[PDB]
Design a protein around this ligand. Structure first.
Ligand SMILES: CS(=O)(=O)Nc1cccc(S(=O)(=O)NC(=O)c2c(-c3ccc[nH]c3=O)c3cc(Cl)ccc3n2Cc2ccnc(N)c2)c1
Length: 558
């Protein structure tokens, strides 16, 4: 069937859309080539519609059916809880899209009578009605990139009342079932340090390792009605409260498998028969679907001793090499099996014999050295998108600060320490806002974080070695240097000069700011301050940070 059908009504904005990086002094101090930085808008939506609209021709076989049964026998061990209205309301981000039913996210969080009454009526409707398709809004996503232009991604989501009901029935399932089913292969259970550790240990555990990333083109459009019903069959293996079992059954048929698309103007836009990006089960469903198809495809391909790592639609496989020619032919057999399963590749996969050359979750393993000179593996990425986005967030107030999440996730990197930490600490210090909590996202979930807490967070997640790394790899240094020239970012010597300046001001303030000066900026000076375990690091409630993925799931933790 067709991933989408369209009425001809346009994908419309709900307000004025900005496509150009503003010319602002603060963002200009970070990046001078502002014309290279753009935000996607509804103006490119038709280009995306064309790419995501196609017929799916899925063929399932015995290997697929065997892997499915193995996944279900593991899902059978799960006992899932039904969330109360109150618990589900508290997981709603303060700025989540308002309901069309006379209340918003603040009303949800305050447990307002109108919000609570409507959510209860939506819940009773899911229990009684197993068929009526649930309305969804289609929007063009506003995302920032560096030129060389991507069309806007399309987001599909139901009303706020429905999103609260999704949490009541499936929050516990989507949080606990993926790890029970996929074990060590579930990527969202790892912090970046644990992801680095699993990848490195997996790589070296092979006699002659071969690895590859597998990029499925427009993964959400490749997800069929059969895939969504297969996903529910896994959810149905859980011990569930009877209303949760009914709500999962009704949600699957009324929302998850497909439904009507309404634009911002309330016009009938089309119809979806594939994965909606903005529902609670997208991350979990995508991971299970990608894991199932990839595991079955590895068997068909006869790839030896596979270790997979799955994060939604992102897939990396590390296996035992059979030889160069054997590997290349087995990879083509893998791709052919994936294509039959309705998961064709974007860029055709290529076998890799160097772990540092594999990009998975838009990241790669690299090496640096700590204070003692010992090797430290850490995750890094090309800094272009992070820097373009940090320039936008400097010139405009955004609901999510990708710079803060990037510092948290990429704390050991040369670019997050020298540029991102220096830029934002300089600005926030001048603005008396180092202690002001900001929203950022970790594995799709939203967190309210004060930048002054960054040292304990970093220590906890990456270890004290994140504050001592030096002698980064030549390939890492060159990718950073080439990015700075391309975007017109000032050179690293300018960043060192700015860091020495803010470090001095941070130290003079005492308290948490002096902790920031000591740990975050020790790299900027020759006279190193002693770095000991931060007392607050050991008490950090980092429960729920690296449990599951919630991209598009409207989740607020913290
Ligand atoms: C819709 S889907 O099918 O769910 N896929 C999905 C797509 C994008 C983001 C997401 S996500 O779930 O929002 N996870 C991420 O965005 C993300 C980050 C990250 C970086 C900076 C700030 N905050 C973050 O969480 C990250 C950092 C390192 Cl060191 C390693 C893996 C990482 N992932 C997973 C990931 C998984 C798949 N593709 C990726 N590019 C990244 C999930």
């Amino acid at each position: 069937s067709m991933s989408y059908t369209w009425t001809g009504a346009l994908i419309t904005p709900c307000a004025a859309e900005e496509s150009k990086l503003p010319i602002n002094p603060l963002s200009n101090s970070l990046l001078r080539h502002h014309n290279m930085v753009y935000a996607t808008t509804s103006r490119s939506a038709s280009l995306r519609q064309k790419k995501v609209t196609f017929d799916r021709l899925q063929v399932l076989d015995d290997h697929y059916r065997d892997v499915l049964k193995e996944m279900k026998a593991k899902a059978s061990t799960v006992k899932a809880k039904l969330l109360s209205i109150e618990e589900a309301c508290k997981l709603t981000p303060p700025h989540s899209a308002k309901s069309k039913f006379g209340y918003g996210a603040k009303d949800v969080r305050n447990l307002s009578s109108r919000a609570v009454n409507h959510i209860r009526s939506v819940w009773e409707d899911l229990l009684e009605d197993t068929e009526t398709p649930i309305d969804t809004t289609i929007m063009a996503k506003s995302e920032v990139f560096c030129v060389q232009r991507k069309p806007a991604r399309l987001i599909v989501f139901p009303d706020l009342g429905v999103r609260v009901c999704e949490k009541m029935a499936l929050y516990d399932v989507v949080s606990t079932l993926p790890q029970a089913v996929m074990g060590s292969s579930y990527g969202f259970q790892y912090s970046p340090k644990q992801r680095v550790e699993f990848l490195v240990n997996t790589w070296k555990s092979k006699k002659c390792p071969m690895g590859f990333s597998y990029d499925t083109r427009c993964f959400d459009s490749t997800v069929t009605e059969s895939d969504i019903r297969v996903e529910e069959s896994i959810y149905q293996c859980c011990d569930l409260a009877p209303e949760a079992r009914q709500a999962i059954r009704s949600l699957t048929e009324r929302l998850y498998i497909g439904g009507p698309l309404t634009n911002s103007k309330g016009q009938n836009c089309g119809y979806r028969r594939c994965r909606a990006s903005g529902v609670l089960t997208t991350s979990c469903g995508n991971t299970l679907t990608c894991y199932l198809k990839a595991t079955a495809a590895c068997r068909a391909a006869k790839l030896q001793d596979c270790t997979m790592l799955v994060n939604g639609d992102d897939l990396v496989v590390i296996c035992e090499s059979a030889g160069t020619q054997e590997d290349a032919a087995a990879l083509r057999a893998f791709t052919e099996a994936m294509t039959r399963y309705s998961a064709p590749p974007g860029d055709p996969p290529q076998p890799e014999y160097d772990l540092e050359l594999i990009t998975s979750c838009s990241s790669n393993v690299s090496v640096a050295h700590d204070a003692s000179g010992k090797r430290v593996y850490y995750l890094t990425r090309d800094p272009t998108t992070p820097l373009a986005r940090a320039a936008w967030e400097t010139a405009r107030h955004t609901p999510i600060n990708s710079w803060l999440g990037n510092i948290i996730m990429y704390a050991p990197t040369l670019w997050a320490r020298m540029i991102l930490m220096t830029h934002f600490f300089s600005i926030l210090l001048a603005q008396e806002q180092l202690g002001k909590a900001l929203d950022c996202q970790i594995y799709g979930a939203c967190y309210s974080i004060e930048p002054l807490d960054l040292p304990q967070i970093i220590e906890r997640l990456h270890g004290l070695s994140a504050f001592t790394l030096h002698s980064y790899s030549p390939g890492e240094i060159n990718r950073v240097a080439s990015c700075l020239r391309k975007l017109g970012v000032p050179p690293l010597r300018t960043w060192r000069h700015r860091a020495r300046s803010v470090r001095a001001k941070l130290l003079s303030q005492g308290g948490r700011a002096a902790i920031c000066g000591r740990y975050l900026f020790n790299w900027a000076v020759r006279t190193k301050l002693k770095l000991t375990p931060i007392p607050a690091a050991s008490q950090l409630d980092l429960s729920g940070w690296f449990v599951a993925g919630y991209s598009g799931g409207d989740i607020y933790h913290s």
